[PDB]
Design a protein around this ligand. Sequence first.
Ligand SMILES: *[C@@H]1O[C@H](CO)[C@@H](O)[C@H](O)[C@H]1NC(C)=O
Ligand SMILES: *[C@@H]1O[C@H](CO)[C@@H](O)[C@H](O)[C@H]1NC(C)=O
Ligand SMILES: *[C@@H]1O[C@H](CO)[C@@H](O)[C@H](O)[C@H]1NC(C)=O
Ligand SMILES: *[C@@H]1O[C@H](CO)[C@@H](O)[C@H](O)[C@H]1NC(C)=O
Ligand SMILES: *[C@@H]1O[C@H](CO)[C@@H](O)[C@H](O)[C@H]1NC(C)=O
Ligand SMILES: *[C@@H]1O[C@H](CO)[C@@H](O)[C@H](O)[C@H]1NC(C)=O
Ligand SMILES: *[C@@H]1O[C@H](CO)[C@@H](O)[C@H](O)[C@H]1NC(C)=O
Ligand SMILES: *[C@@H]1O[C@H](CO)[C@@H](O)[C@H](O)[C@H]1NC(C)=O
Lengths: 316, 316, 316, 171, 171, 171
Amino acid sequence: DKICLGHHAVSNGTKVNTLTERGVEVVNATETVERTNTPRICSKGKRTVDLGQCGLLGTITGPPQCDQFLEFSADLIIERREGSDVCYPGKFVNEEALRQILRESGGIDKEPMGFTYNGIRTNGATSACRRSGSSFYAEMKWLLSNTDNAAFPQMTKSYKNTRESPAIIVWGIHHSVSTAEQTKLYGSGNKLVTVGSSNYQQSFVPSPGARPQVNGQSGRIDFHWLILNPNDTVTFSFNGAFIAPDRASFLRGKSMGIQSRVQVDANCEGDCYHSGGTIISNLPFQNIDSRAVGKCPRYVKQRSLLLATGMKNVPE
Amino acid sequence: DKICLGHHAVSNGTKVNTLTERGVEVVNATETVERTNTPRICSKGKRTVDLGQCGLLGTITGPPQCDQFLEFSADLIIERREGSDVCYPGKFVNEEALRQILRESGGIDKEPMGFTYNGIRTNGATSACRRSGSSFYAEMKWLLSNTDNAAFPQMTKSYKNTRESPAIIVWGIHHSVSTAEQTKLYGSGNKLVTVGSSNYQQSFVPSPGARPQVNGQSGRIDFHWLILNPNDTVTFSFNGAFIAPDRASFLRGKSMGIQSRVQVDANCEGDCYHSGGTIISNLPFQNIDSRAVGKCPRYVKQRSLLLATGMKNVPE
Amino acid sequence: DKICLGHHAVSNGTKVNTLTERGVEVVNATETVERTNTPRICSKGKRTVDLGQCGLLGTITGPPQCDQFLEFSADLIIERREGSDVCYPGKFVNEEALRQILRESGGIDKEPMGFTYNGIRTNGATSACRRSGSSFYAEMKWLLSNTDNAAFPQMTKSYKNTRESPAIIVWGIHHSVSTAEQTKLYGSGNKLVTVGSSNYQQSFVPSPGARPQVNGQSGRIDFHWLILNPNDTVTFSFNGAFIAPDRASFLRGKSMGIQSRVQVDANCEGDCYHSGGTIISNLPFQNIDSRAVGKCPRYVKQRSLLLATGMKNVPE
Amino acid sequence: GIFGAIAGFIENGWEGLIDGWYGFRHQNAQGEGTAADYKSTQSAIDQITGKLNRLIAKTNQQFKLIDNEFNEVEKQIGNVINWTRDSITEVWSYNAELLVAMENQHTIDLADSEMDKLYERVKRQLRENAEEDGTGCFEIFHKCDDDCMASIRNNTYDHRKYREEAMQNRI
Amino acid sequence: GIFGAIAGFIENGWEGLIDGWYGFRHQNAQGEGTAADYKSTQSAIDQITGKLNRLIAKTNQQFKLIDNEFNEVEKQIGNVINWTRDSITEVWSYNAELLVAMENQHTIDLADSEMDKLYERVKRQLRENAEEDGTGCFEIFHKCDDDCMASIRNNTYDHRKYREEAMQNRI
Amino acid sequence: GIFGAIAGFIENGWEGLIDGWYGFRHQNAQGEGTAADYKSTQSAIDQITGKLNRLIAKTNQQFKLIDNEFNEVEKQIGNVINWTRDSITEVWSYNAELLVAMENQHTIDLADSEMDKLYERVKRQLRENAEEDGTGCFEIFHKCDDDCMASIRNNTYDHRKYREEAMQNRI
Ligand SMILES: *[C@@H]1O[C@H](CO)[C@@H](O)[C@H](O)[C@H]1NC(C)=O
Ligand SMILES: *[C@@H]1O[C@H](CO)[C@@H](O)[C@H](O)[C@H]1NC(C)=O
Ligand SMILES: *[C@@H]1O[C@H](CO)[C@@H](O)[C@H](O)[C@H]1NC(C)=O
Ligand SMILES: *[C@@H]1O[C@H](CO)[C@@H](O)[C@H](O)[C@H]1NC(C)=O
Ligand SMILES: *[C@@H]1O[C@H](CO)[C@@H](O)[C@H](O)[C@H]1NC(C)=O
Ligand SMILES: *[C@@H]1O[C@H](CO)[C@@H](O)[C@H](O)[C@H]1NC(C)=O
Ligand SMILES: *[C@@H]1O[C@H](CO)[C@@H](O)[C@H](O)[C@H]1NC(C)=O
Ligand SMILES: *[C@@H]1O[C@H](CO)[C@@H](O)[C@H](O)[C@H]1NC(C)=O
């Protein structure tokens, strides 16, 4: 008569790695690295704005793509490859800083600066910016000389920011296809746009010249911007070739901005996003996308790392 | 008769965390994360310079705030919120690189460049920069045309760096409120300032225009700088709108620069600084300020992490 | 009668560190941090290009040093202190970005842009750039006015990238010693060079002025560049002070670029390089050079960390 | 490994046992049988459970874009971002594989520990009314029935009762 | 945990004992008393002391400002700096919380280890002149007076002295 | 340390033994001699060998220049690069020094474990035909010749053959 002690085992162990050996059979194991993507922007419970064809920076200038996004409000902003910041061709100076501000802004709220204008025209359109026919950036104003070749009376305009939040001010500079048509639009002569607001001083001159056509247009508008802090003034000193800000934009709160190519889906909750979807997982690590943003498991190189949840499996 | 073995215990254990359990009672523990700030710049034993109202970059140009700091020498440089780099309003181009150079310089030592001048004025003051009435940047020279509207004779001046250490050269560019008074100060015409060393080339043009008043002044000086290396020349070709360097600055050694809002205290020694004081601690980690500089415990998110220094506490 | 159990030991243990004590004697240990440099560029089995006196950026413009490197092809590119990007003195704007592109390019392959020219000369040489007497950048064109003071007919030229890979476009801007000799070279007047692709808009004006002599020359050319993506055009509108691209450069593949002061050696294989040689080692860490590149052991501060490969050494 | 029990002096384990991790197999008058020790099984499982709650855990620290997949950022800052991200990836890949190996060493050796604690808890019940067979059973040198067996398995067994019987059964 | 002693076969410990960590309680002719084993206590403390000198330690690597609390730096480089600092903070918070848990596991189980080393250290002195009680004392089956007690506590005790006596007292 | 054997109850070891790590020294009729236990030696070495293959290993992650030793990069981005590189250097110096200390603790205590496993494999063969001397030998209370010795060393030894013989030698 005797009594034996023992431990359980199985016919099918899972192999794991240790400090001293590779591929040891243990009874049961569980995976530590997430490999399963879910190919949608799992947006349940969140105020979501999908910009589609509007580019993020269009929200402040107002090209036709962005007419319903001029005063959006969101917890989650989604950028699309098809989006475009622009109707008349051009680009933003210091552009990715502005995007990073806007992505986390929780949306923007516009306020007029109410600039009035004596002695020029205020209303230049273009076929690139089509609404009812030939139009222009909604939040800005193509400031022209009265009549063809007429003088551009050297002007100044100021805007103080009344509000308790900082403001995004943006203006434009027009680069005409030629020195000839720089003259037809804003008269002759060296044309200097200068800009300063207390803790910021800078200045601009157009550069007319030939560039290849984009949206049927060989000219360019480059946009500039500055953050005007509460109770500070900005003065716009200029003599033409100046696209002028109609409205200043203010930030609403906090948000999360992402770039994606998959569909929004309000049936699932997630907080870790990448461009091919959402990483839904309790696991500490992931091997799906190193540029995943939000609240994410850590990206690691390994596709798998099994963590033992049972004893060594020793069969006969 | 028998003999029993046992181990000590207590009525009041400290709870700690392990790889397998949260909150196990152990006999004694000690904390691993520092939470106690000490709200002073504990500066014992160190050559300290508190700049107060002088801005770090003022030490190079010489606004009245910085008159007693033009040739300082220190192990520890302290920057204050009330400090200002400037008397006539303006700014430094590429300014935070210069600050980072100056913070670790162990102080500066000035040397004249002895520029002499034929055919202009040398001595423009202003009500913004007040010593005995209207003055100007101590280390610089407001270079004017002889009389109102007179020509600015297009000049050149060179300075070679005799010394065996590299030099900080700085010049200015004046942006007059209007094109009219750009003319009253430095005559008519396009105003071109260009500057080059042998391994550095760049160039500058003023931009007159209206900007809002700061220290009663609607004009601006922006300053530029380059590090001239031993045995090379820098040449200043210019025709007006030029604030000129009287003296070149040289670096003394090594220092530690911080930004703070608390008081100096020579009664305590420390090496880990932040803006609200000093972190004095042997502990490996701290939860006080993630931007603490010097020689610091590592910042972690957790406010507490107790490390066991005794056995399991098992009472009855 | 009895039986004893025991374990081996030795007269000379190796001291190691543990979680609980410093310097416990163990039987045998092995080193974990690599200290041994090998002072050669271990290049066995790799297509190597040692640029010697040619600077990496010279491969795009073509100064005499770089005549044998205008179309190189490599797995490993080696940069030398004696290298120089330049014959007529000057700079690349945004220069280290271009270097980082070229270092990993696996070499470049040139293609003509075949620009033709009506109404100017095409062929300015100089004493700084000596081949058989006065020459110039091989890949570029000193575009001059017909005769001294003659007009520079304001021109435009375009190049489209036919090809399936992106192209490196490069142009120059000449800064004449004086406005006087700016006129002798390209006639009088404001000189506006403007440049835009579709995905890029920018513009340039020369800045004549005095700077100290380098290679007997007081003038400067600064070079600019843009990446032209497949099936897009770049247009060059200009009226003088313009160094023009003869050929566009294309990237071949992948490479590894390093900077070094030691000799190539095809007798040894390595993948971890620094400027004083090659780190050949299986060890996980190294204490040789924190800026080692390639596939390297991790740099650590400690000079030594011994890992026990045996039991406690207990002698008598 | 390390505590000598599993894959040690108790060569191979029991595909038979399905109610727990550790157990008793007896051979007495009535025959062979098996039954699982819930108390050591629970001490193992809940230690393993502790590990899983520590690692199947959530960062609440948010990271944002500093990069751009559609309009690439300027290449110098682009290369610093990629250089930094790659360095951080190296750290976490190292941490992850070291974490999993470290806890696997501890898990395996923690299960091995929990049975040597089981072995030597009964070797202590049966005083010297038994000896160790060597391969992890106990030679009971006296008679023990299905009620005397569950006497051991639930930690009631008195050894003084059968001390008499056993001392001369062993000679 | 892991070596079976503390919170194992030695149920609960002694708020009484205060000259050390581990100790002997005897009940003999004259009665009860306790006294602490300095040598096992010292090896515990001195191991714990090693850990503290390794961790209560100062980096001599200096870090400087790349940032600015008064005049914010330009926002692109600002966001890269914050992104980098946040990533490093995640590493050190992970390292710290794992370091403390890892060394806490080792501290607790090293203290349990130092008692099983104590236990099976006298069981080796008392040869076969005692047996296991089960709950961490030794039933001495012969006489031991207050000088025979300090005989064990200071590792002099000869067992052949009372071997004669004990062998038949156990029958 | 921690399993009580090396630098414990077997104080000091044998510069003599050179064919292995662990071994038997006997003193019987024919005299003294020594011989090395190949299985425990192999189980130690091969575990240490596992550690070395895990650490003497190559990253395949390539890093490039973001810096410049000949023409220094602009000073702000220069300072961010150096700030970042210094921070990661701190991480790897910490990881390295903790890795080596952690594996040294485990290596040392792994060798000590492999001997307590050796001790108590023999104490279980020799059943009741010997006792523990206290300092790591077995007093064999019966006669054992050079064939009785290699009987133990090869795990053949039956104890019932000398059970009769030991039981009357021990009184
Ligand atoms: C295997 O492990 C996982 C995690 O511990 C658990 O969810 C699952 O139920 C386990 N299965 C068994 C049979 O133990
Ligand atoms: C702004 O200006 C008004 C003065 O009319 C004042 O009431 C307010 O406190 C100022 N400060 C801020 C931060 O708005
Ligand atoms: C508790 O631990 C700390 C740090 O190890 C020590 O200074 C203190 O003396 C300890 N107290 C006791 C009672 O052990
Ligand atoms: C600098 O200039 C002088 C020339 O007279 C010379 O003595 C010195 O060696 C030069 N070189 C350096 C590195 O200072
Ligand atoms: C480029 O243009 C040609 C048009 O002739 C077209 O065939 C080709 O697919 C385009 N795309 C690329 C990537 O070359
Ligand atoms: C940085 O890495 C991404 C992928 O993570 C790659 O697409 C990108 O091209 C890299 N940066 C540059 C400048 O190429
Ligand atoms: C970076 O973090 C600090 C606080 O740590 C914050 O004040 C600052 O605004 C952040 N940077 C930006 C660009 O917002
Ligand atoms: C950055 O570190 C490198 C190498 O450690 C050093 O040579 C360089 O001087 C440092 N940065 C600056 C701006 O000097």
